[PDB]
Amino acid sequence: LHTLRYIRTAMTDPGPGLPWFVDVGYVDGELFMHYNSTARRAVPRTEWIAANTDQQYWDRETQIVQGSEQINRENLDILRRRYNQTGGSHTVQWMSGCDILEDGTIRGYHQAAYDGRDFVAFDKGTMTLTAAVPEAVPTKRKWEEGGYAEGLKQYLEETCVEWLRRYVEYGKAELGRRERPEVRVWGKEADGILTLSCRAHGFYPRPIVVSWLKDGAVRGQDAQSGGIVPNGDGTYHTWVTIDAQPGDGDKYQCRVEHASLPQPGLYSW
């Protein structure tokens, strides 16, 4: 699975000293592009993208997102009028991109949200814009009569994919690397309860399975994951806890399944 993802937010309330429009690009979860309404320029966010592109590329990308900023500026006015609202805290969100699956087949998305709730989604197959809400019906007729569906189908199926294949090749050293996590497991006692905590520090790539074992057997009872959260250096962290009976510290182990490990790693307190 390979993914190219463009996500952008137009805000009424960023707020103080922060940009109202922020647009960012993602290749396989990795941030490579940034645009904001203050700077008014599209900038690289990784070393692998900056080394493989000239300023002729970035000026061209700047012209596109500057247009996208002004469209989403007016969208804030339009949808507040659509919902009969004045001022306040409001957001327009866009999610655009394409997938190259393990199958070798291509998925494509271009969908929006108003105030964190699904507004419209483009159907690549039928070449129509789906309206998730009754207030999104006037958007549907405006968008389809604009005739954007023709070009957007071609972009998501061809142009987006061509760029993504090129980006995967540009940043192969970073995207294909394997980083082994330093794993620790800690025990703490609250009120009449032992809570055990497992932490995987600094792993890449993102996919990871972290399970608890009691006497060898896998336990999901009173287990909780904090998901996969990022570090500042492009590596990942994950935090998994389990509630247990007091005294049972030596019974528990933390099973880590990751690409950097040829066999699963077990860790104890």
Binding site: G25, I64, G67, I71, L79, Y148, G151
Partner: peptide
Amino acid sequence: GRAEEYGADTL
């Protein structure tokens, strides 16, 4: 690798 058509953002 953005699309030339930024009008596709119209709501």
